[PDB]
Structure 1
Amino acid sequence: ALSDLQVFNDWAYKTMSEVLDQQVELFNGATRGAIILRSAGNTGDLSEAAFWAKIQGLVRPRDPYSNADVAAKDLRQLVDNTIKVASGTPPINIPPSMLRWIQKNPQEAGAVIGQQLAGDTMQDMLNNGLAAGKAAFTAGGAVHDISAAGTGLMTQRAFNAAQRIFGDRSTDIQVWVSHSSPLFDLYDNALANAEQLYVFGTVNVRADAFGRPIIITDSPALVSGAAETLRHSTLGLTTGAILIEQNQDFDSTVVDGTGKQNITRQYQAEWSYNLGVNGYAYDIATGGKAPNPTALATAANWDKISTSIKDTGGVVLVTK
């Protein structure tokens, strides 16, 4: 315009706030059922489940022309548990003053907190489930370390070596939860050389040579160390490998306070999710890690009751 006229740069308040910066969409269909987000009510520190054990030698060769005594067999029942992980929200100073000053309602602040929590809650659940995943898989012995081998960077060959643990269960494997860094190193290697020469470089937009899609996430549960001690973790989860039973025990409070220039209002939320069944039959040892886990209690103290490693679902691949 010009100096004579007055310019009034228009402005606005965005209803949508920034939610997250990490890929946390790894549940049900997003992960091919590898990680399951369920809603159920569970009582106690954990929830046990008893399933009958597999009978070995249940079918035997039979001779109609003979009648020899056959050894008898007994039934057994295995029991896997599901620990309850509690997560909360720190006090959030939400005085109505600031809202009223910009002509907004404190409710709007509550809605913003709820819309940010929606994403932050699922993130914690995922990160904790991933940490428990590596812990349970390390405890079960389904670990493959290529870090020492050569450069230690992830390659297409590493997937076949990792899936080799599950002979027929290799196909049952759904996705390959990994970190963005090792994925770049994987493709960097292929893009550098040996693409469609040694390894099937960029077989898909982001999948392995066996078709299993690679769901990368900047999860701290997948990075351990720095510089030379920095190691990455890739989980070959099968269907139903991880289970998140979000308990409907979410609580929240709005405590306002006086004695100050402006009303001091705060917000605190609390909830819990039965994070368990980290694999077909993986039972967390609560006795050795306390009833309530803090995302560090696991410490690979999970127990495996599955008769065969193939029964349990999920393998951990460790690369530099």
Structure 2
Amino acid sequence: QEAGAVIGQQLAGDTMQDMLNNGLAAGKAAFTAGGAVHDISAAGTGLMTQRAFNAAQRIFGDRSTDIQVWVSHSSPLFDLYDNALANAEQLYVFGTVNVRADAFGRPIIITDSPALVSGAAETLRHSTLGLTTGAILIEQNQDFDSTVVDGTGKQNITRQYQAEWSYNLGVNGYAYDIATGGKAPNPTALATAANWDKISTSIKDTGGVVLVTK
């Protein structure tokens, strides 16, 4: 009968998951609207261990140091593992085939968020987007409310659990176009480009870049 406790555990987990996924989707959409995207789908298989990241560095320009992480789906990580595990160019030894970084001091963080994957079969595309110092900001507002309410009129007394909360999204150098968007945006409303204005004059000030690999 520990329904409240079970719901609490699952709700904490899914709240973390939902804020993370919404932040990732908003970041990807905003960077795509800003032009900081490199599409690698036609060149060879679709993803290279390390030569692909140089494209994102070339996008971000003289401030390439300001990127120090690569949020990625698990499939790109396994593709890096496989290509590294088959070193056509001999720069790996058996003790170093499990490198997680990108040979530039940037660790690669792995998550399977649906915001970083799209399509199926031959249209499957993975987004592995790199960040800057505090590029994507998520501010939860401390307004959690929850109730348990019983119901009368049915064959059994219907018990309910309902919760509500809120948080705020902010991507560095980008503003959410509320006129084209809305007062309260859906998760698919955040992922839609043209709702994300580019405030900062230079792409370097804007924090992040998206790498698209199949």
TM-based fold match above 0.5 = yes
**Partner Cα separation in structure 2 for residue 249 and residue 109 of structure 1:** 22
* CA distances 1:62-112 after superposition (whole Å, capped 9, x unpaired): xxxxxxxxxxxxxxxxxxxxxxxxxxxxxxxxxxxxxxxxxxxxx832122
Contact 1:176/1:237 (CA < 8 Å) preserved in 2?
Answer: yes
**Residue 285 and residue 165 in structure 1: after superposition, are their counterparts in 2 closer, same or farther (change >3 A)?**
farther
> Which residues of structure 1 form unaligned runs of 5+?
1-106
Segment drifting more, 211-220 vs 183-192: 183-192
Cα distance, 1:154 vs structure 2: 3.7
Structure 1 residue matching 2:2: 3-state secondary structure: helix
**Residue 191 and residue 299 in structure 1: after superposition, are their counterparts in 2 closer, same or farther (change >3 A)?**
same
Contact 2:173/2:199 (CA < 8 Å) preserved in 1?
Answer: no
**Residue 298 and residue 200 in structure 1: after superposition, are their counterparts in 2 closer, same or farther (change >3 A)?**
farther
**Partner Cα separation in structure 1 for residue 176 and residue 67 of structure 2:** 17
Contact 1:154/1:183 (CA < 8 Å) preserved in 2?
Answer: no
Segment drifting more, 192-201 vs 150-159: 192-201
> Which residues of structure 2 form unaligned runs of 5+?
none
Cα distance, 1:279 vs structure 2: 5.0
Contact 2:72/2:110 (CA < 8 Å) preserved in 1?
Answer: yes
Q: Is the radius of gyration larger for structure 1 or structure 2?
A: 1
Structure 2 residue matching 1:294: 3-state secondary structure: helix
Cα distance, 1:299 vs structure 2: 3.5
**Residue 130 and residue 186 in structure 1: after superposition, are their counterparts in 2 closer, same or farther (change >3 A)?**
same
Structure 1 residue matching 2:128: 3-state secondary structure: strand
* CA distances 1:189-248 after superposition (whole Å, capped 9, x unpaired): 121232644999957641111010100111111111111110100111111111111122
**Residue 124 and residue 310 in structure 1: after superposition, are their counterparts in 2 closer, same or farther (change >3 A)?**
same
Structure 1 residue matching 2:47: 3-state secondary structure: coil
Q: Which residue matches 1:128?
A: 22
Cα distance, 1:309 vs structure 2: 0.5
Structure 2 residue matching 1:164: 3-state secondary structure: helix
Cα distance, 1:289 vs structure 2: 8.7
**Partner Cα separation in structure 1 for residue 141 and residue 122 of structure 2:** 40
**Partner Cα separation in structure 1 for residue 85 and residue 142 of structure 2:** 47
Contact 1:176/1:213 (CA < 8 Å) preserved in 2?
Answer: yes
**Residue 279 and residue 233 in structure 1: after superposition, are their counterparts in 2 closer, same or farther (change >3 A)?**
farther
Contact 2:85/2:97 (CA < 8 Å) preserved in 1?
Answer: no
**Partner Cα separation in structure 2 for residue 232 and residue 318 of structure 1:** 6
Structure 1 residue matching 2:137: 3-state secondary structure: strand
Segment drifting more, 243-252 vs 229-238: 243-252
Cα distance, 1:273 vs structure 2: 1.0
Structure 1 residue matching 2:70: 3-state secondary structure: coil
Cα distance, 1:281 vs structure 2: 6.4
TM-score w.r.t. the length of structure 1 is: 0.60
**Partner Cα separation in structure 2 for residue 225 and residue 202 of structure 1:** 33
Q: How many aligned positions are there?
A: 214
**Partner Cα separation in structure 2 for residue 110 and residue 251 of structure 1:** 14
Which is helix-richer, 1 or 2? 2
Q: Using the aligned pairs only, state the percent identity.
A: 100
**Residue 288 and residue 257 in structure 1: after superposition, are their counterparts in 2 closer, same or farther (change >3 A)?**
closer
Match of 2:81 among 161, 166, 187: 187
Cα distance, 1:159 vs structure 2: 0.7
Which is strand-richer, 1 or 2? 2
Cα distance, 1:298 vs structure 2: 3.0
Cα distance, 1:183 vs structure 2: 1.1
**Partner Cα separation in structure 2 for residue 307 and residue 137 of structure 1:** 14
Segment drifting more, 152-161 vs 125-134: 152-161
Cα distance, 1:132 vs structure 2: 0.8
**Partner Cα separation in structure 1 for residue 23 and residue 209 of structure 2:** 14
Structure 1 residue matching 2:23: 3-state secondary structure: helix
Cα distance, 1:291 vs structure 2: 5.4
* CA distances 1:127-148 after superposition (whole Å, capped 9, x unpaired): 1111111100100000111111
* CA distances 1:20-67 after superposition (whole Å, capped 9, x unpaired): xxxxxxxxxxxxxxxxxxxxxxxxxxxxxxxxxxxxxxxxxxxxxxxx
Contact 2:181/2:189 (CA < 8 Å) preserved in 1?
Answer: no
